[PDB]
Design a protein around this ligand. Structure first.
Ligand SMILES: [Ca+2]
Lengths: 256, 256, 256
C-alpha cells in the first residue's frame, strides 16, 4: 500500500478549495514526496509495462500541484551547479586579460578551455566547444554552437541558433570549416566536416551534412560535402523519380 | 515638452565628434534615461498608433549611443538573477552526490528538480524540464531541450538543438517518447506526444508533431504520431493534388 | 624541434596502458601544453596550408587524452565569467521588484537591460535582447530568442527554439513584430522586420524573412514580409518552372 496516489488524486479534484497558503500539510508532504521520487527516478510519469507505454496521471497532477503550492522566489547563480572534466575558458580571467584578448563574451555565453577566439569576436549567448578556433571579427549569435575542432574564418556571421557540428573522430577527417567572409543564416546547421568555402551566403533553414545534396540549379550538378566559394544557398527539395514525394536539398541559387 | 528626442537626435548626428571618454554629461544622462524608459516599458522602439506600427528612430539611436558610450566590463555570474517557483536539480549537490549519480552536467546546463537522469548521461549545455526521465548512457547535446514529462530511453543521442516537446495536458495523453537506441539529428523537433520507436535514426531537420505526415516511401502509407522501430527518417515534402505546391513531410527512406 | 607531437602520439598509442591516476607527468605536461596552445591560438586542430586545409591528428589526440586524464569535478557559477558593455536586466533586482514586475525568469534565462517584459510573462531559459518589448501574458519557451527592438504582443506563445530576429539598422525599418494572440511553433524563425499579424498560428519549422514567399494556397497570391491576421502557416515548397527542384516557402493553409 501507498497512499500517495490517492492523496494527490483527492487534492487535485479538491484543488479549487485550497491555495498555497492554507494547504494542509499532508497534501504538501505528498506532493513533495512525489517530486522527490520523480527526481531520483523511483517514480516516472510514463513507463513501458508489458510492451505498452502507460501514463501515470497522478504524477502529472503532482507536478501541477507543485506549481500551485509554491510561490516564485529569487533564484541566484549560486543555485546553479555543474560537474564536468573540462574547465570553462574564462574562469579567473582578469579584466586585463579580457581587454587584451579583444573578445566580447555576452552573458551567459560559455566557451570551453582549449578553444580560441581572435580579437573582435563577439560571442552572444552561445557555446564554443574544445578545439574550435574562431577568427577575427566573427559574430557568434544567440544560441549558436561552434562544435569541437570547428574552424570559423575571419569576418564570419553565425546567425542565431546556427549549429557548426563538431568533429573529433575519425581522427583523419577534417573538422567542419567555415571560411572567411561567410554568412550563415538563422537556425542553419553545417555538420560532419562539411566545408563552406569563402564568401558564401547560406540562408536560414539550411542543413548540410555529408549526406545532403547541394544542387547547383544552373549546372544541374549535385555536390556533397562542400559549398563552392561565393555560393548563395537556400533550402529546397528535389523530386523523386516517381513524383510521389521530394527530399530536402540545399539549392545553390546564384554565385556571387 | 521632452528634450530627450532632440538631445539624442543631435548627439547621434554629432557622434563622430565625441567618444565615451569626453562625452558631455547631458548626452550621457539622456541616453541613460532612454535606456531606463525602454527597460520599464514607458518607452518602446515601435508601437501601434491609429492601427499602424510606427518606429521611433531616436530610441534606436539611443540604443546605439549606449553601445558607443559604455566600454566592456567584466560581468560575473552574481550579476545574473532569476525568479521562479521550481528549484533547479543540482543546487547544493555535493561532489559525492554528483559522483554517485554518474551524470555529467556541462556548464551552463540546467535541469529542473523533479526530473531524472540515469548513470552515464551527458548533459551538454541544455535544459531538462520537470517530470522528464533520461535513461542510461544518453547524450543531450548543446541547446537541446528535454521537455516536461518526456521519456528518453537508453543510449539515445539527442543532437544539438533538438527539442523534445513537453506534455502535461491533457492528463491522459502519453508524453513525448524516444525509445532506446535512437539517434535524433541536429535541430530536429519531436513534440506533442509523438513516440519514436526503438532503434530509429532521425536525421537533422526533422519536425514531427501529431499533424506531421510520416510518409513510408516504400509502402505509400502515411502514418501519424509514431515512427516505427528501425526507421530512417529525413525531411521531405509531399505534392499537392494540383501540383502548385508541396507541404513538409517526414520521409521514411529505409528500415534498418 | 618540438617533442609535443611525438609525446602525444606515443601516449595515445599507449593509452590502454595508463590511466588518469598513474599517468607519468611528462605525458600529463605535454597534454596540458597542447591544450594551452589550442586555447591561445598558437596551435589549431586544422589550418589552411598552401591552399588546402590540413588536420593535425596529434592535436585531436591531445584533446582526447585531456578527457582521459581528468576526472569530473564540481564546477560552480563563479567559474563562469563574462565581458560585455550591456548590463543584464535583473542584476540587483530585489524580491519586491521581481514580484512587482510579475515576470517569471526561469534559470538560466537572461534579458538585457533596456528591454521590457510585462506582467504574467514567463521567460523559460531564453534570451531577450536590448530594445525588445514583450507584452502581457506571453510565454517565451526554452532557447527562444527575442531579438533587438522586436515587439511581441499580448498572449503570444513563442515555442521552444523560436528566433525573433533583431532589427536596429536600417533606422527607418520596423522591427520584427508578433501581434497579439499569435502562436509561433517550435524552431521557427521570424526575422528581418517581418510582421505576423494578430491571431495567426505559425507551425513549427517555419522560416520567414523578407525573401520568403508566403503562398496563400487558396488565392494563389504570394505575399512578402507580412503574415495576414488569422493565418495558419506551415512549411512547404514551391516548384520551379522546369520541375527539376522546388524552393522553401511558407504556406498559408487556412484562415482562422
Ligand atoms: Ca556567486
Amino acid at each position: 500500500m501507498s497512499q500517495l496516489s490517492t492523496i494527490i488524486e483527492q487534492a487535485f479534484e479538491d484543488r479549487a478549495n485550497f491555495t498555497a497558503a492554507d494547504c494542509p500539510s499532508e497534501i504538501r508532504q505528498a506532493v513533495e514526496e512525489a517530486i522527490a521520487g520523480l527526481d531520483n527516478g523511483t517514480l516516472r510519469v510514463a513507463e513501458k509495462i508489458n510492451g505498452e507505454w502507460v501514463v501515470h496521471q497522478w504524477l502529472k497532477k503532482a507536478v501541477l500541484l507543485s506549481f500551485k503550492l509554491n510561490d516564485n522566489k529569487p533564484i541566484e547563480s549560486c543555485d546553479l551547479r555543474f560537474y564536468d572534466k573540462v574547465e570553462t575558458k574564462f574562469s579567473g580571467w582578469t579584466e586585463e586579460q579580457f581587454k587584451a584578448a579583444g573578445v566580447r563574451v555576452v552573458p551567459p555565453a560559455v566557451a570551453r578551455r582549449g578553444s580560441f577566439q581572435a580579437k573582435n569576436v563577439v560571442l552572444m549567448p552561445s557555446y564554443v566547444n574544445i578545439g574550435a578556433y574562431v577568427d577575427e571579427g566573427t559574430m557568434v549569435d544567440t544560441w549558436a554552437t561552434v562544435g569541437s575542432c570547428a574552424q570559423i574564418g575571419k569576418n564570419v556571421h553565425l546567425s542565431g541558433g546556427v549549429g557548426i557540428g563538431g568533429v573529433l573522430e575519425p581522427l583523419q577527417a577534417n573538422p567542419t570549416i567555415i571560411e572567411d567572409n561567410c554568412f550563415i543564416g538563422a537556425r542553419s546547421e553545417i555538420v560532419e566536416g562539411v566545408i563552406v568555402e569563402e564568401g558564401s551566403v547560406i540562408s536560414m533553414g539550411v542543413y548540410i551534412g555529408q549526406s545532403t545534396r547541394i544542387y547547383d540549379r544552373e549546372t544541374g550538378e549535385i555536390h556533397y560535402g562542400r559549398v563552392p566559394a561565393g555560393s548563395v544557398v537556400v533550402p529546397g527539395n528535389l523530386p523523386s523519380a516517381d513524383g510521389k514525394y521530394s527530399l530536402y536539398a540545399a539549392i545553390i541559387v546564384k554565385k556571387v
